[PDB]
Design an enzyme around this catalytic site. Structure first.
Site, PDB file in Angstrom:
ATOM      1  N   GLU A  84      13.558 -68.445  20.225  1.00 29.24           N
ATOM      2  CA  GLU A  84      14.001 -68.760  18.844  1.00 29.24           C
ATOM      3  C   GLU A  84      14.045 -67.494  17.970  1.00 29.24           C
ATOM      4  O   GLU A  84      15.043 -67.266  17.229  1.00 29.24           O
ATOM      5  CB  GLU A  84      13.083 -69.808  18.238  1.00 29.24           C
ATOM      6  CG  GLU A  84      12.920 -71.059  19.096  1.00 29.24           C
ATOM      7  CD  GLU A  84      11.830 -71.033  20.177  1.00 29.24           C
ATOM      8  OE1 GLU A  84      11.575 -69.990  20.825  1.00 29.24           O
ATOM      9  OE2 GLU A  84      11.262 -72.096  20.415  1.00 29.24           O
ATOM     10  N   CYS A  94       7.877 -69.739  15.401  1.00 32.10           N
ATOM     11  CA  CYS A  94       9.336 -70.034  15.421  1.00 32.10           C
ATOM     12  C   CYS A  94       9.625 -71.168  14.436  1.00 32.10           C
ATOM     13  O   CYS A  94      10.651 -71.126  13.711  1.00 32.10           O
ATOM     14  CB  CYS A  94       9.760 -70.294  16.849  1.00 32.10           C
ATOM     15  SG  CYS A  94       9.631 -68.791  17.857  1.00 32.10           S
ATOM     16  N   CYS A 107       7.141 -72.994  18.880  1.00 35.00           N
ATOM     17  CA  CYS A 107       5.759 -72.671  18.462  1.00 35.00           C
ATOM     18  C   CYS A 107       5.669 -72.590  16.930  1.00 35.00           C
ATOM     19  O   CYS A 107       6.689 -72.672  16.226  1.00 35.00           O
ATOM     20  CB  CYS A 107       5.323 -71.396  19.157  1.00 35.00           C
ATOM     21  SG  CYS A 107       5.832 -69.875  18.316  1.00 35.00           S
ATOM     22  N   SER A 144      10.422 -76.944  22.639  1.00 33.73           N
ATOM     23  CA  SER A 144       9.839 -77.199  21.308  1.00 33.73           C
ATOM     24  C   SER A 144       9.294 -75.896  20.735  1.00 33.73           C
ATOM     25  O   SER A 144       8.625 -75.164  21.442  1.00 33.73           O
ATOM     26  CB  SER A 144       8.714 -78.185  21.474  1.00 33.73           C
ATOM     27  OG  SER A 144       8.286 -78.630  20.203  1.00 33.73           O
ATOM     28  N   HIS A 196      10.113 -64.477  21.253  1.00 33.33           N
ATOM     29  CA  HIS A 196      10.356 -65.838  21.734  1.00 33.33           C
ATOM     30  C   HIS A 196      11.860 -66.111  21.714  1.00 33.33           C
ATOM     31  O   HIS A 196      12.622 -65.410  21.027  1.00 33.33           O
ATOM     32  CB  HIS A 196       9.612 -66.816  20.839  1.00 33.33           C
ATOM     33  CG  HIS A 196       8.119 -66.706  20.960  1.00 33.33           C
ATOM     34  ND1 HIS A 196       7.281 -67.710  20.476  1.00 33.33           N
ATOM     35  CD2 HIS A 196       7.348 -65.799  21.598  1.00 33.33           C
ATOM     36  CE1 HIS A 196       6.026 -67.363  20.766  1.00 33.33           C
ATOM     37  NE2 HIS A 196       6.044 -66.188  21.442  1.00 33.33           N
TER      38      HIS A 196
HETATM   39 ZN   LIG Z   1       7.863 -69.263  19.209  1.00 31.54          ZN
END
Ligand SMILES: [Zn+2]
Ligand SMILES: [Zn+2]
Lengths: 151, 151
Positions: free
Chosen positions: A58, A88, A85, A83, A56
């Site tokens: 992040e 993250c 998950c 935003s 991801h």
């Molecule tokens: Zn994530």
């Protein structure tokens, strides 16, 4: 910390736009030292670039920071275009990154946002139009890629 | 339950491999509950890859490759050590219903209770091999443990 928020969101959006042009999901981030504004790391989603389940934007950002003494994370802001998950969110909680600045939570919002506040982290949603537009463009062009990832 | 000895044996083999490579002895694997098939297996890669995000559980998930959402819903994730907030968040995000933990004595996560509150099953087996190898690392390399735990 907020005096670096323009820098941090500009870098995060640049990472998202790099990812988009690479044919990936346009989610980007960076990790900034709150005192001096130095960029510790930056990254974007590598799902399509690397066939990666876990990179991801992040996660990629934190990975790109390299090995750090734990104390480094305690005075940083993680910038993300979208935003985070629950995975993250958990990385922010685990490293004790005190502040998370979020481009937008219109195209996606997990329970992670609220859980960060429950665990004592500051969450700032800037509701940035550039972030919303690039994410909405990906979702419109590539709905199966999007809704297969986020469900 | 049928596959739990296999899952913990593989997780411990991954921890033992990481130990022998010079890394943090935390391993995992993701098993399909229906047939015992190993979807992926991995260990902490902080030392091997300079990675702040490749915990054993994340490395395991990465090594499975991009799976369909529906595949995770009938798996167990085996980990030799309690899953930290990040790995707990990964279990939540991918929707893995069950996590079998080798031990939670050298480290116990706030994530275990969070998993249970989010509807996931957490089983702790208190494996003496897992406890021994992790204690040996912590005792011999306290500075590396302080770094790995992110304090
Ligand atoms: Zn994530
Ligand atoms: Zn972890």
């Amino acid at each position: 910390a907020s005096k670096w928020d323009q820098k941090g969101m500009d870098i995060a959006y640049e990472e998202a736009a790099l990812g988009y042009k690479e044919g990936g999901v346009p989610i980007g981030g960076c990790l900034i030292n709150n005192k001096d504004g130095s960029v510790l790391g930056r990254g974007h989603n590598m799902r399509f670039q690397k066939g990666s389940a876990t990179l991801h934007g992040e996660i990629s950002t934190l990975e790109n920071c390299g090995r750090l003494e734990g104390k480094v994370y305690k005075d940083t802001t993680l910038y993300t275009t979208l935003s985070p998950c629950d995975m993250c969110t958990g990385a922010i909680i685990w490293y004790g990154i005190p502040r998370c600045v979020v481009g937008e939570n219109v195209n996606f919002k997990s329970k992670g946002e609220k859980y960060l506040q429950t665990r004592g982290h500051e969450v700032v949603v800037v509701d940035d139009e550039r972030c919303k537009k690039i994410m909405k463009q990906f979702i419109d062009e590539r709905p199966q890629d999007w809704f297969e990832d986020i469900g």
